[PDB]
Symmetry: D2
Subunit: 115 residues, 4 copies
Amino acid sequence: CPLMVKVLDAVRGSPAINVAVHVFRKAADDTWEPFASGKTSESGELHGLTTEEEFVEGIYKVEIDTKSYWKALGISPFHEHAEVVFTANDSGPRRYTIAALLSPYSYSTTAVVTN
Amino acid sequence: CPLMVKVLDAVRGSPAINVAVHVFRKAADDTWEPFASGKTSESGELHGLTTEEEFVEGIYKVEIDTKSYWKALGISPFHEHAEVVFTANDSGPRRYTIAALLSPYSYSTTAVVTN
Amino acid sequence: CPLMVKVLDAVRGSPAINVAVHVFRKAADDTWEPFASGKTSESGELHGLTTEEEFVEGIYKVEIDTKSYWKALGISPFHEHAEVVFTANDSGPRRYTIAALLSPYSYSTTAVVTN
Amino acid sequence: CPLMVKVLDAVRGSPAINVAVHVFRKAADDTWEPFASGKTSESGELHGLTTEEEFVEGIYKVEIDTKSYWKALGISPFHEHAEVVFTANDSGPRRYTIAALLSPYSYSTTAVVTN
């Protein structure tokens, strides 16, 4: 998959399961166009968001619904979401893994980019 | 000072100096209204963004211009910016520090909320 | 595998390849006994450190040779290693993934523990 | 103050208060000699560990007692402690801040080295 998202829970030491993820692409008019969406699996992974064909060059935003995740576990967290904004495919097709590590008042995000 | 931002550079082991920071408040129509901005100091800090009176409950977004930071150091970055989105809640402690730790392909952010 | 180690490089956005890892186990005399060792692969993974049989209860230390990694890439980093110390298998056998995200002046480590 | 330690709690969004911290210096025989210790303050900080005169070049280990911290909050932790091992180098900046961000199954540490 050219775009994969992995989410971990730093309180439980577990994959973050059933986390909603929305991907947008910046349009020529500077608005955010919906691009793809999905939910993390039992492994905390979300595959199959897009295809080589559809994932063209652009500025992408990956919005991870961390507040819905924490509220479903009965926790009141700080952030509304984790937002990951990046230019993709500027020098040709690449494969992107966007990882997020979640705590109720903190998160980390890392990109692994492969050719 | 209800709202302060601290930025650290994980590659050099230093405060992240002269980083542009923009704070937005979400409007009733779901747009982002500019609210406050500035540049981190020699200590990596940005104070004086707002006042108790101005900083009402609401959804806020803090955009840290990480890409320009890494460009000025001659280092190739992944993200356009770091985005921190949160609801201000008067029920909790009154002083918010939004910390960010920057690497070229990764960042973390933490909210330190104190009285 | 009951014990796996994954290492990422937050400067390159890549797996951290050929990273030496040493695992120790605390002996009844309080010294650190060598337990297993290995090197991360092209994927940044290290499997096959141990077996269900050998990985009994105890206090384990996973030492990741981050300074050798950075020096091989021509970089002078801050830490000597990343050290991950934990009690394992206290309530029966579990599978542990120890992840580390490396920058020259910073690192993160996460444990994913599965039954 | 050549050596200062700052600890943050990612679950509560707060300084990590009353955390025990032990600093060791590596001896010629490869053992760890106690060097300095204390408990983080209400701000999560530990100042006054050493002096310019005492803090000579050498390999140091900072052990942060994360397990006792999480136990006192009634939260189940993974790590025994957080370990930060580094060489002090007079060629670089003179003030070292060792920051740590704590979650139950994850931590990060960063060195902020300034003049």
